[model samples]
Target: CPLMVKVLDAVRGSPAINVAVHVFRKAADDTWEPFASGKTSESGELHGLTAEEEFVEGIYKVEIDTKSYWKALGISPFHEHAEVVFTANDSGPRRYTIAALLSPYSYSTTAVVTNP
Candidate 1:
């Protein structure tokens, strides 16, 4: 299995933040729809979609609620939302994992088969 997708924030240490992820796939009719959705954990990691048994490979996008996450911490963010688009090689593997790290000012991410 390979990592289908991952997102992260590279701004060092920050307070607790919550992010929302949306997986979208293009259909035969050339329309995009929600495929899967998840939220970041306490460690800023979002996981556990491997056992779903139904995933399509295509252009995937991730959207983060930057303003809301920062607002909860009594901080102001420059951006209200952040989005990243990437491709998922679904035919390559099954057990894939995604991760995102966020801060009050910025975010970063990565896609890989495994983390170690």
Candidate 2:
């Protein structure tokens, strides 16, 4: 139940040997507790920190360190970091596919099944 995933740049979408991804959930303690952390892989995929159990519900966050990744591509990022927050509307274990679509000036995501 390591409910973490990949972020990409090529591969149409794969992880760059890039900067960052940290996964967190709104904890019972009311704190945004991080459960996973890591960076992009050589295969152009983002690696994630190991996370389970508590990742099952509530509002989740993915903090992306974007500047380094973009800079490596020989471009300056419009955003230094992208902080994403998503809410899981139901209880218990769930599965969703997350994709980050990027361009020189911006990036956007669609979590499919995955609904809003």
Candidate 3:
């Protein structure tokens, strides 16, 4: 099974399209290793980005190129990059979803793993 992480430019009430998103899995020592990468689509979402074939029980990070995204919108982003840190538990569900609400100067995220 795979997962979908939704990205929305909250201030504009539109999907944050075409932003670079990178996934990294954390190791025992808190080191992050690249796992997957993708960009937001017109739908403001990335389908099956990281919670796909390689996902396991661990901490994962999704780094979005927020600076560039805001730059394209002609605004200065509060953070150079927006990071969404989540946990994927194989012992739990097979479906994972993370929703990120982003503004020009602030952002928040909600992540959930549901049983299928």
Candidate 4:
């Protein structure tokens, strides 16, 4: 897949199942436009967000709805959501793995970029 995401629940020591994800790309006018959205799988993985050609070269943002996930589990999260912003395919086509570790009080995220 050109773009993928994996979410882990730090508190539960398991996958963050069914978390919502949203993707946006910055247009030439510097406005953010919605690109794709989906929910995580049973394994806490989300894939096939966009085709390589459609993804293109631009600034992108991935929003993870951590608040809803935490609320569903009966906990109030510190952050309203989690966001990862980056430039994709600046030089050439690439693959991305956005991994997020979540807790009620805090969260951490990382991006792994590789050749397509």
Candidate 5:
């Protein structure tokens, strides 16, 4: 399967911060279903949800809960959430990855698969 989409920097800060990746699939009716969810590791990366789980083809979105992550460090955030929207052409090969780097003020992401 070709890279459909990658989302990085879900959070805005460093190791001290905690971040999560929420994957949602858009249905034909224009609704969404929770597909997968996970948190970044110490190195600030989260490989696609996990191979044990499966994702269907459809429009998708990722949500990073930034509010509590910032508040934990006693900092205020300008945004409550950071989101990335994408579409999956098909569900073949069963491999989709998402990675991110986060800091208190910035973040970056790529759809390419990186060793978790």
Candidate 6:
């Protein structure tokens, strides 16, 4: 598992379970190419989206399905979705951990990288 993700629900002060996440790579034609997708577990964690060799050097975007997550809890959210974009594998293969904090009207995201 070269890539991992964690999401938290700020409103409930708990891990965001079952949140959908989509990963995309920037293609040479300036388009986002779909790479992999998954949902958070009961611990609000997602992993194994891509392996080291397959995840090459490029720009990547992570799209989280926030609307559906909030809606599932019987609440309406302001943002349609949440996204995080960054560059990966530039300095060599590394591990990535993306953490997202979500609320009805706002969100925060961060990334941690380490030698794989």
Candidate 5 local lDDT, 1-116, one digit each (tens) = 22233333344334422466676878778887787777766655555564433544567787776666667768786677667777654544445454545455765655653322
lDDT of 5 at 51: 43
TM-score of each: 0.67, 0.71, 0.87, 0.97, 0.65, 0.96
Highest lDDT model number: 4
CA deviation > 4 Å runs, candidate 4: none
Query: Which residue pairs show backbone clashes in model 1?
Result: 3-113, 7-99, 7-100, 7-109, 8-101, 8-108, 8-109, 9-101, 9-107, 9-108
**Candidates ranked by lDDT, best first?**
4, 6, 3, 2, 1, 5
lDDT of 4 by residue, 1-116 (tens): 88999999999999999999999999889998999999999999998788876878889999999999999999989999999999989898889999999999999999899885
- Cα error, residue 62 of model 6, in Å, equals 0.4
The CA lDDT at 46 in model 6 is: 97
Model 2, 1-116: lDDT tens digits are 23444456642355556667777888899899876777766754453454444456578787777778777778776887777788864655565645565655677776654322
Root-mean-square deviation of every model? 3.8, 3.8, 1.8, 0.8, 4.9, 0.8
In model 6, where do residues sit more than 4 Å from their true spots? Answer: none
Assess candidate 4 and give its lDDT: 0.93
Q: Pairing residues by index, what is the TM-score of model 6?
A: 0.96
Error of 1 at 11 (Å): 6.6
lDDT of each: 0.58, 0.64, 0.81, 0.93, 0.58, 0.93
Residue-level lDDT tens digits of model 6 in 63-89: 999999999989899999998999999
Candidate ordering by TM-score (highest first): 4, 6, 3, 2, 1, 5
Comparing 2 and 6 on lDDT, the stronger one:
6
Q: Which regions of candidate 5 deviate over 4 angstroms?
A: 1-17, 89-110, 113-116
Scored against the true structure, residue 107 in model 2 reaches a CA lDDT of: 79
Assess the local accuracy of residue 27 in candidate 6 as a C-alpha lDDT between 0 and 100: 97
In order of listing, the candidates' clash counts read: 10, 7, 0, 0, 10, 0
Model 1 weakest 10-residue run by lDDT? 1-10
